[PDB]
Design a binder for this molecule. Structure first.
Ligand code: HEM
Lengths: 563, 654
């Protein structure tokens, strides 16, 4: 029970339990919402008072604000999950505000999900208390399954765990007071008699007065409330929109044109895109250039594995692998063959852009994935079967100033199972971290198994370790990993030099393979051996290739939201 | 469960964790394998001895027979879950019991066969076929076999060998054996046949390792790795008994009987464990006095088993027949109607426990003549409530974990079904049946050609016509799909005993709640919706439709949140989420809540199952979909789809 590797965490939100069907997109519907008519309904609900729960001060504004803040106050950067865009099992007194909004959800039904309705109720409450917010973006599909200086540091830490700076933390604290700039929160907390303490009576937020950096931050706002009104606008925006993905995922006509630093923005498509006859002119140009299949697949997977299917940030778009925060990570081994791949895939970019049919310019963030797909095509063609990996271009390269080291320092994988990376600070073993990594990328069990089996053989291993590889000749996409694992002629033992690896004796005289910990799980766990026995049969060689191509393509197209 | 209804049971084994894909039907694959090639592969795998698990007598056959038994010996009738066709004797919850010890090394011996076919031979099928072919290879003309037990890639959530926990008394063990074989619907003669002819093949076998559930990963999913001796073979420890029954453990003959009836069987103690019976003879060693267990020796003292066994001592052909029939019943117990047995080995003769529905003997009606039957049904005075209740009662006695029951056969008129409590036999069922029979007679006497309708079709046809009429009265001009091809089976083709288990002790779709149920009504409704293979939205829409239609037990008001009955509308959903009413447990406290409509009026009335949808946090998210202002057509379409899912659920011919 406790130590059982549960595969149920992969199909956590299936399509069988969705009451909407397969053919149902949340992007063609909320764009048709007339927010000018929805705000009237929200105003009516805010003004009225229902008898089953009386209206505090005859107004539901503050309740909606607290519901919105509490719904988007459970975000955590280390894992990404939580936030507002999720299901989060939609306290007690804050589970009735979800049922005080039914008169609005009833008029729309499917064109306005709860995850949008609650947060929009909060934002409209802010706009009704006399505040000019920054904007709003719909499109949060909801899952269908579940003393001062002693607390001052705690406040600075709790917000620091929610990707919140110091000035923005102060803005969020002061804004909640609710935000109407009439109660004069900071206007009295700084000009009041100090004999009135715990020992009118103030609250326990006296940290804002006594903490040095907090007091310095609030000194500006004491005499310049306009900067407070502007800083709370960005703080609220960040609070309710941290969970959602790139800027291209924002819907509705209320979204503001001004792009921010924390969205991880990328430049728009300032040119034409590469056609179909031209990508075949690049694939044959990607090879015959020096790069083998190992380097190309490692580079391509190293830029699209940073995705996080919880807050939908990271991914292959933008092409930040060439930039600073990721070309320095240990898993993307910088002193190895990464500074050479990056330089090689820029001469091709320069050469192609020089001699191009007009203005058909391709970006580096596109060339990296194109090189990966060309490498897989070559590897497959070297193993009998031939296949063309499908491709959806349109990525753009982001400059150094668009990204941010501090925000990207959390995306560093503490352990990457598909590449046998295992650093330090690993409480869980290497199997559960593989499961979590596959859950973040929105991978299903067959997809996870086929991806591991393909990546081991292809060459994507940390520092090209001989671990995992169960093939007599690499640089060829075969199912030889599954066949040699399900094979029962070998005998597995813990390694003599005990460091977490294993050793597969061939039974008779010698040692053939050298396994690992995130590898023998597939050969041991029955629920995964059931899939290994499917991909490692006699006839199912083409099935493995087709499934690997499909899973690879879906992983690469994970973060493609504009198309 | 203590609390927190687990709606993850309604979608277990989904189409996501399924490597084969979506467009893959097993019945179109296994019907093409050369079964002779499969036999020549299995009969060769059970001969070459692997070095990591040496074969006793150089013949794995008995191990395969034991594996086949233990794979289908977990089938329990009282719910139908578990057994052969499931395939869960391979996943974690079942490969860790001490009973199924050394039954994983057995399941890995068949890999050199499964790999040769890959996807045209399921594991849950290959295990049982390997058992049957091992039985065949030792000189035993078995009854038959039928492929088509699809594997499932996710574990679902569903006897001592010495006596009642340390009491080697055949008097004590005999009753336990009889009960644990009643639990699988076995008779007494069939139980004796299984115990005798299953232990004629093979032999039995502290300081062992952990189960594969918690074994080290270098074991490769195995377990129970013993350190005594070489560990595997000639010292193998799997049940710690070390008994050899038959004179030749690799050949079929009645040598069990003369041994168990030509000795006196003193009591001894095994090296590992204890409590085995020994005579006060010589059996060839795999690589010894005649010994017997306590359960096996129970067949010599129990008077009920005494007559059967001592008669089998004189005429062995009776044993040769009864064991074959019992084995056939065992491995095919939970695979379903005879229409699912595909493969060139299926027998032609039918059996009573198969619940046989006779084959059609007339031209089936078309989708051009049913426009007259639907008119006649709706023009016969029968209300929508009666037709819907009859149709649901016909198609609610189905078990998706056992594939038995269902609408086909037309049992709703025969004895075991018409007399149950949930589908009242007082004026409700006994009146609809007469009118339906009259209508079928009128149609058949005036048929165009040889086209003839069967009564088993008319119950579903009347249900469909009633639903169409209700939807037309609500304001939608839809038509409900219907596929004919059902037949009516006579009374002597229905085992009255075998349907007593099918009686629904609690049916959440009709507010029926009897006695003896452990869990409350909500969990019973969840289990019912799991048996019919219904997802959460399908269950919600079915409940919401059946409440308003009027298919309650005794047509009680407990759940009809509508003042306009006989009208298929979502009024059960919009009025449930009406937060302007306040609920209150009734002073009678009979489990029937009631909603005081604002001031003092007790307008509605509910039940513990009709209020879960408005209380459970994750199950209200579905009610809030169909309860919107515009999702009336969506609700109607989803209800029709779920109704077709329930009606055409046992149809395997189509
Ligand atoms: C309550 C009923 C039964 C009990 C308690 C029982 C008990 C046992 C035990 C303790 C073993 C020793 C396992 C080992 O050492 O590997 C065994 C083996 C065996 N059983 Fe049963 N048994 C029962 C019914 C059956 C049935 C119905 C069959 C039908 C085929 C069967 C077939 C076998 C065979 C073939 C073996 C030989 C296994 C081998 O050679 O490794 N038994 N049984």
């Amino acid at each position: 029970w406790p130590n059982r590797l549960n595969l149920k965490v992969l199909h956590q939100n299936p399509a069988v339990a969705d009451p909407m069907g397969a053919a149902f997109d949340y992007a063609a519907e909320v764009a048709t919402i007339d927010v000018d008519a929805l705000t009237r309904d929200i105003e009516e609900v805010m003004t009225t008072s229902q008898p089953w729960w009386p209206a505090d001060y005859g107004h539901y504004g503050p309740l909606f604000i607290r519901m919105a803040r509490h719904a988007a106050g459970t975000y955590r950067i280390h894992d990404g999950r939580g936030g507002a865009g999720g299901g989060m099992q939609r306290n007690a007194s804050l589970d009735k505000a979800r049922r005080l909004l039914w008169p609005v959800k009833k008029k729309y039904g499917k064109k306005l999900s709860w995850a949008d309705l609650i947060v929009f109720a909060g934002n409209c409450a802010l706009e009704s208390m006399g505040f000019k917010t920054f904007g709003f973006g719909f499109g949060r599909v909801d899952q269908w399954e579940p003393d001062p200086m002693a607390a001052a540091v705690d406040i600075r830490e709790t917000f620091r765990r929610m990707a919140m700076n110091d000035v923005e933390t102060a803005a969020l604290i002061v804004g909640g007071h609710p935000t109407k700039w009439d109660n004069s929160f900071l206007e009295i907390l700084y000009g009041y008699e100090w004999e009135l303490t715990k020992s009118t009576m103030l609250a326990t937020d006296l940290s804002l007065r006594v903490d040095p950096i907090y007091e310095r931050i609030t000194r500006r706002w004491l005499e310049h409330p306009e900067e407070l009104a502007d800083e709370f606008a960005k703080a609220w925006y960040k609070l309710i929109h941290r969970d959602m993905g790139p800027v291209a995922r924002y819907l509705g006509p209320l979204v503001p044109k001004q792009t921010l630093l924390w969205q991880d923005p990328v430049p728009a498509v300032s040119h034409d895109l590469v056609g179909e006859a031209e990508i075949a002119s690049l694939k044959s140009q990607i090879r015959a250039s020096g790069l083998t299949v190992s380097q190309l697949v490692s580079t391509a997977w190293a830029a699209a594995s940073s995705f996080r299917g919880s807050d939908k940030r990271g991914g292959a778009n933008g092409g930040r692998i060439r930039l600073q925060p990721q070309v320095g990570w240990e898993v993307n081994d910088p002193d190895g063959d990464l500074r050479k791949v990056i330089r090689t895939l820029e001469e091709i970019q320069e050469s192609f852009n020089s001699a191009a049919p007009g203005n058909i310019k391709v970006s580096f963030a596109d060339l990296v994935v194109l090189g990966g797909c060309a490498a897989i095509e070559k590897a497959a063609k070297a193993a009998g079967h031939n296949i063309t990996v499908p491709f959806t271009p349109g990525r753009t390269d982001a400059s150094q100033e668009q990204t941010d080291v501090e925000s990207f320092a959390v995306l560093e994988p503490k352990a990457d199972g598909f590449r046998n990376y295992l650093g330090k600070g690993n409480p869980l073993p290497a199997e559960y971290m593989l499961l979590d990594k596959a859950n973040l990328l929105t991978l299903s069990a067959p997809e996870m198994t086929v991806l591991v089996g393909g990546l081991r053989v292809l060459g994507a291993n940390y520092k090209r370790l001989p671990l995992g590889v169960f093939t007599e000749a690499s640089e060829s996409l075969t199912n030889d990993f599954f066949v040699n694992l399900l094979d029962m002629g070998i005998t597995w033992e813990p390694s003599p030099a005990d460091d977490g690896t294993y050793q597969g004796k061939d039974g008779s005289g010698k040692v053939k393979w050298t396994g690992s910990r995130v590898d023998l799980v597939f050969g041991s766990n029955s629920e995964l051996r059931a899939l290994v026995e499917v991909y490692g049969a006699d006839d199912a060689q083409p099935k493995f290739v087709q499934d690997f191509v499909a899973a690879w393509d879906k992983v690469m197209n994970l973060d493609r939201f504009d198309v």
